[PDB]
Design an enzyme around this catalytic site. Structure first.
Site: not given
Ligand code: TXV
Ligand code: TXV
Lengths: 275, 259
Positions: A18, A21, A23-24, A36, A129
């Site tokens: 959490s 961003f 909470t995942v 998320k 980022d």
């Molecule tokens: C395209 C771009 C610019 C890139 N590259 C971008 C832009 C904005 C957001 C994201 C983005 O990636 N969103 C996002 C949405 C949902 C999620 F659950 C997660 C997320 O933490 C995870 C999704 N699987 C996961 N397995 C394991 C673990 Cl520990 C965490 C996660 C997440 F990060 C990517």
């Protein structure tokens, strides 16, 4: 819309993290997913717009090296559903775990990261980022680029309060991003600079600026042009092509940095040479 | 938008024929596969088949379904997807006779059931599930596709399908039967009917219900719940077979019990 997932279908499981961003969670939906969630109660205008934008960015992407978007929900919570990634980030491997990769594998990580970034830029998406903690080593064979710490609240003020909140990204920030002399100083070329810093991490095994003792000094000196990564610290097996490519990606004048098509082509040639 | 402008893809080695046309390895922000119709003007049938395939593929976003990436229409109809590295499940079980541990065999079954559950949730009938259409990407992630000759289906055909009961005998339940045969391949390391020499005999006797897979061939460490699930998926009467949500739940549970 075709990607909306009806309420009741996803089993929301363990909370993973959490923060700013949302909470995942790990979840079940035709297999493993990540979910998320961006609000608990009625969402604010900001939250709704952040959710719409993130879904809109992710829906543009279909590439093996980009986190797979799978769907969204709007009730009872705004939720973004993606594949589950199993393993650790590159940052965690290199800097928290003492993982020792062979050069062929270091180059493959660079190659897969360059493929993902080349794809993003082809879809007109600036990542904003890129850093080793956003490079997920899934099943230790596939890179998944994500943005695993995207803040829902965006500041209105182009200021020096930003640097606290972005403390986890300072090392990967191009000089023009640090200086913030434009209201939105991010570009394809700032993503290329970040990739240069990732190359530095891969080829040295270290973070840049390891002997600088505080973040304010990094911000000031990188902004002024007086601090640069010590490229001499590359490991003895660093290929010559990588020394050159890293220096080009880190060029101070943004328009002198190479494009991802050129970066990718260079790394593909190197990987062939090592195979 | 998923249309890829001409000139962007470098079309490389020819791999084989697809469900229509020719499959090549290519370069497009990394590796891709490209299935192209190498004709100068497509027929109505060809255009419709292309449209149907793109339309189906665009509905899919799941780790166990081959990733659609884009298409082109000029100069030739082309469907672009991820490249899969490795070999099909057919190749591993029957050609290489790769010796998987039971935990991995169950994991392959689990991943295949996730992909199929997903397809059926999206209202997609596969119609040609078989081990040649299950790619083991990087030797460990299942990718379901319809690869045709790039990687032949009577062994996976439910009795109603093999006997040509009507002009379209396919259903989610005939996909379930095909999955039952994939379970049989995983759990025995063999194709069904390996002793029967004649295809026409298989067609006749499977259609009539006088030949079915020899479940005595299952390996001694096949979990009992998996053998029973396989038998349910293989029921000769269509309406007696389970749905994929139930199949997936059962495999998830029995897999958890093993480890
Ligand atoms: C395209 C771009 C610019 C890139 N590259 C971008 C832009 C904005 C957001 C994201 C983005 O990636 N969103 C996002 C949405 C949902 C999620 F659950 C997660 C997320 O933490 C995870 C999704 N699987 C996961 N397995 C394991 C673990 Cl520990 C965490 C996660 C997440 F990060 C990517
Ligand atoms: C969704 C559904 C119902 C499923 N499931 C379905 C329906 C119709 C067609 C396909 C379908 O999969 N199409 C398709 C299109 C383009 C290709 F290049 C290939 C293709 O041979 C390959 C795609 N990567 C590959 N790596 C390696 C090798 Cl050896 C071959 C390929 C391909 F099979 C899938």
């Amino acid at each position: 819309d075709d990607w909306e997932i009806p309420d009741g279908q996803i089993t929301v499981g363990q909370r993973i993290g959490s923060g700013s961003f949302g909470t995942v969670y790990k979840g079940k939906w035709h297999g493993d997913v990540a979910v998320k969630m961006l609000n608990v109660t009625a969402p604010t205008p900001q939250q709704l717009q952040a959710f719409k934008n993130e879904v809109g960015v992710l829906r543009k992407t279909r590439h093996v090296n980009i986190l797979l978007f799978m769907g969204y929900s709007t009730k009872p919570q705004l939720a973004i559903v993606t594949q589950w990634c199993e393993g650790s980030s590159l940052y965690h491997h290199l800097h928290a775990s003492e993982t020792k990769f062979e050069m062929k594998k270091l180059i493959d990580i660079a190659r897969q990261t360059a493929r993902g970034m080349d794809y993003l830029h082809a879809k007109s998406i600036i990542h904003r980022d890129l850093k080793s903690n956003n490079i997920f080593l899934h099943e230790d064979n596939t890179v998944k680029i994500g943005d695993f710490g995207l803040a829902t609240e965006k500041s209105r003020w182009s200021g020096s309060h930003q640097f606290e909140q972005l403390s986890g990204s300072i090392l990967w920030m191009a000089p023009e991003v640090i200086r913030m002399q434009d209201s939105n100083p991010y570009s394809f070329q700032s993503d290329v600079y970040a990739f240069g810093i990732v190359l530095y991490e891969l080829m040295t095994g270290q973070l840049p600026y390891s002997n600088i003792n505080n973040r304010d000094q990094i911000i000031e000196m990188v902004g002024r042009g007086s601090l640069s990564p010590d490229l001499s610290k590359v490991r003895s097996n660093c290929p010559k092509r990588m020394k050159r490519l890293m220096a080009e990606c880190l060029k101070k004048k943004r328009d002198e940095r190479p494009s991802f098509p050129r970066i990718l082509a260079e790394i593909e040639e190197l990987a062939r040479e090592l195979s």
